[PDB]
């Protein structure tokens, strides 16, 4: 390259939820976000562009609702995750030789 990079470039911040919201979990099987993240990593981690995969994670988490909770006002409530990209290129995890 001819060009310098900003020191803050090529960061990707992947959050379970947008600012100001509660995140959710199954009783003991783990968080909505990490469960769906891991499922998409298992199926697509080695092929899809990572932010393309994080978008699938957003859709999977968006399908869930709170079925049981001690706070009864949380029942039926929802969650969308949020990723913040300062990436400058396509990110793939193709199998390494």
């Amino acid at each position: 390259s001819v060009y310098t990079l900003p020191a803050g470039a090529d960061f990707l911040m992947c959050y379970s939820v947008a600012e100001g919201y509660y995140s959710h979990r199954e009783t003991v099987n783990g968080s909505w976000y990490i469960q769906d993240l891991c499922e998409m990593l298992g199926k697509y981690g080695s092929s899809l562009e990572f932010t393309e995969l994080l978008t699938l994670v957003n859709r999977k988490v968006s399908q869930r609702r709170v079925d049981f909770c001690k706070d009864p006002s949380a029942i039926g409530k929802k969650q969308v995750p949020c990723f913040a990209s300062m990436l400058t290129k396509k990110l793939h995890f193709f199998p390494k030789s």
Binding site: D10, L12, Y21, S23, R25, S31, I34, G45, L91, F94
Partner: protein, 144 residues
């Protein structure tokens, strides 16, 4: 200018995935236990290991320990690594993540991997993953 340009991912190593897993907290923080986090930790360990990452897990570190460990990884050479992954499984408050005993400014943690502090990750992806609540609002359901 190539619209299809990909990060160079043909280095000797994929790189390190750091997982900070927080199940229990110092009693005086009055923070609920994170039952199921160990399933998340193990699940992320399998998935990132299968993608070629060297997965390094640390359970219920206090602020001093967490800051030492992450500073350490920031100061080792990533020159022969594709990228860096850092996972926090904990509670949060504003721009802070909780260790066992206290909260840490997330910008203190990401700041260690900025280009001026971590030369061997310049031009390479730095991926932060945070399972934490970011406030006290439940989002409400809607229909097409």
């Amino acid at each position: 200018f190539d619209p299809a340009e990909k990060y160079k991912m043909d280095h000797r190593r994929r790189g390190i995935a750091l997982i900070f897993n927080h199940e229990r907290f110092f009693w005086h923080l009055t923070l609920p236990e994170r039952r199921g986090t160990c399933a998340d930790r193990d699940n992320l360990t399998r998935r990132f290991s299968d993608l070629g990452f060297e997965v390094k897990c640390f359970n219920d570190l206090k602020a001093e320990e967490l800051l030492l460990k992450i500073h350490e990884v920031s100061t080792v050479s990533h020159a022969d690594a594709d990228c860096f992954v850092c996972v926090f499984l904990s509670h949060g408050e504003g721009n802070h993540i909780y260790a066992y005993d206290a909260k840490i400014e997330i910008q203190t943690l990401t700041g260690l991997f900025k280009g001026d502090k971590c030369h061997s990750l310049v031009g390479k992806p730095k991926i932060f993953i945070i399972q934490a609540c970011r406030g006290n609002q439940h989002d409400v359901p809607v229909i097409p």
